Design an enzyme around this catalytic site. Structure first.
Site, PDB file in Angstrom:
ATOM      1  N   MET A  24       0.841  -1.201   0.000  1.00  0.00           N
ATOM      2  CA  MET A  24       0.000   0.000   0.000  1.00  0.00           C
ATOM      3  C   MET A  24       0.870   1.242   0.000  1.00  0.00           C
ATOM      4  SD  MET A  24      -1.953  -1.049   3.681  1.00  0.00           S
ATOM      5  CE  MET A  24      -1.887   0.726   4.065  1.00  0.00           C
ATOM      6  N   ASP A 136       4.391  18.173   9.959  1.00  0.00           N
ATOM      7  CA  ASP A 136       4.036  17.775   8.600  1.00  0.00           C
ATOM      8  C   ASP A 136       2.554  17.526   8.449  1.00  0.00           C
ATOM      9  OD1 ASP A 136       4.756  17.506   5.899  1.00  0.00           O
ATOM     10  OD2 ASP A 136       5.861  15.646   6.170  1.00  0.00           O
TER      11      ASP A 136
HETATM   12  C1  LIG Z   1      -3.295   9.222   1.257  1.00  0.00           C
HETATM   13  C2  LIG Z   1      -2.080   8.339   1.264  1.00  0.00           C
HETATM   14  C3  LIG Z   1      -2.333   7.164   2.197  1.00  0.00           C
HETATM   15  O1  LIG Z   1      -1.535   7.042   3.124  1.00  0.00           O
HETATM   16  N1  LIG Z   1      -3.398   6.337   2.031  1.00  0.00           N
HETATM   17  C4  LIG Z   1      -3.813   5.342   2.888  1.00  0.00           C
HETATM   18  C5  LIG Z   1      -4.928   4.611   2.487  1.00  0.00           C
HETATM   19  C6  LIG Z   1      -5.434   3.572   3.277  1.00  0.00           C
HETATM   20  C7  LIG Z   1      -4.841   3.249   4.486  1.00  0.00           C
HETATM   21  C8  LIG Z   1      -3.700   3.928   4.898  1.00  0.00           C
HETATM   22  C9  LIG Z   1      -3.089   3.541   6.223  1.00  0.00           C
HETATM   23  N2  LIG Z   1      -3.778   2.887   7.176  1.00  0.00           N
HETATM   24  N3  LIG Z   1      -2.951   2.699   8.310  1.00  0.00           N
HETATM   25  C10 LIG Z   1      -1.738   3.202   8.131  1.00  0.00           C
HETATM   26  C11 LIG Z   1      -0.590   3.301   8.897  1.00  0.00           C
HETATM   27  C12 LIG Z   1       0.528   3.935   8.343  1.00  0.00           C
HETATM   28  C13 LIG Z   1       1.801   4.056   9.137  1.00  0.00           C
HETATM   29  C14 LIG Z   1       0.496   4.470   7.053  1.00  0.00           C
HETATM   30  C15 LIG Z   1      -0.655   4.395   6.257  1.00  0.00           C
HETATM   31  C16 LIG Z   1      -1.798   3.767   6.758  1.00  0.00           C
HETATM   32  C17 LIG Z   1      -3.207   4.987   4.108  1.00  0.00           C
END
Ligand SMILES: C=CC(=O)Nc1cccc(-c2n[nH]c3cc(C)ccc23)c1
Length: 274
Positions: A24, A136
């Protein structure tokens, strides 16, 4: 071995207890086999870029220390192998940035309200209880889920030029500015500083242009418009503190107001692609 604290229980887990469902720093959607929970799993490579790695370790440090904040994304546990660290993180549905992109425009004010409550609290919590500034704040770091939860993510630099506050670009609460900018971005569907081709060009507009307020022709509540105007006070010494902002009417209303963020989210996620 790794220990996961997830769904209220403590488990001894082996990296084999995680079923990878795809990608992802480096992130995998993974299913925990002992329970069926689906989680985000960050990988830190022993052989990786040292700057990435220390960023990851900083995010991790804040996140571990923020177990008591429900507005900050939770870490269930870690796995350390000889060559890698895997970090089990709360999986969210999507971020605010991806929702803007899918929606082809404005997120409704009532959702920005709930989001604003949550993010200001996460920010306030980490200032108060840990002396941490996020540095950020932007829509990619604001996450939402099917259960209508909104949370803050990614404290690796606890920073994107686009959302930098004036006093950060030129010094004699910068996070509150960046929040202001995100909200205008998300309420209007357009990042307010238009047609910038480089970072420094956005920095130039931040300083030379008027604060990019909510447009009066969109019929936003006065509450909301004033919240943004307070956040987008260019003179940081005049820009409000979290404890002032917590009593702003915009926050106070959407805090006590009943908003079905989950149904809105479920329905928007259904009706769109990518
Ligand atoms: C907009 C960019 C994005 O990060 N999208 C996104 C889309 C769906 C789930 C996550 C996400 N869920 N839990 C996380 C934990 C971390 C450290 C980074 C991203 C996620 C992130």
């Amino acid at each position: 071995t790794g220990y996961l604290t997830i769904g209220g229980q403590r488990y001894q887990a082996e990296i084999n207890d995680l079923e990878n469902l795809g990608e992802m720093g480096q992130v995998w959607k993974m299913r925990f086999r002992k329970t069926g929970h689906v989680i985000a799993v960050k990988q830190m490579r022993r052989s990786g870029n040292k700057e990435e790695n220390k960023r990851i370790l900083m995010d991790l440090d804040v996140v571990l220390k923020s177990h008591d904040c429900p507005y900050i994304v939770q870490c269930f546990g870690t796995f350390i192998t000889n060559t890698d660290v895997f970090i089990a993180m709360e999986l969210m549905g999507t971020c605010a940035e991806k929702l803007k992109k899918r929606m082809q425009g404005p997120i409704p004010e009532r959702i920005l309200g709930k989001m604003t409550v949550a993010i200001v609290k996460a920010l306030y919590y980490l200032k108060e209880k840990h002396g941490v500034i996020h540095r950020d704040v932007k829509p990619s770091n604001i996450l939402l889920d099917e259960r209508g939860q909104i949370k803050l993510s990614d404290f690796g630099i606890s920073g994107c030029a686009a959302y930098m506050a004036p006093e950060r670009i030129d010094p004699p609460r910068a996070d509150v500015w960046s929040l202001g900018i995100s909200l205008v971005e998300l309420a209007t569907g357009q990042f307010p500083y238009k047609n910038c081709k480089t970072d420094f060009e956005v920095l130039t507009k931040v300083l030379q242009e008027e604060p990019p307020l909510l447009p009066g022709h969109m019929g936003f509540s006065g509450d909301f418009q004033s919240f943004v105007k307070d956040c987008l006070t260019k003179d940081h010494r005049k820009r409000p503190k979290y404890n002032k902002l917590l009593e702003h009417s915009f926050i106070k209303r959407y805090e006590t107001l009943e908003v079905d963020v989950a149904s809105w989210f479920k329905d928007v996620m259904a009706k769109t692609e990518s």
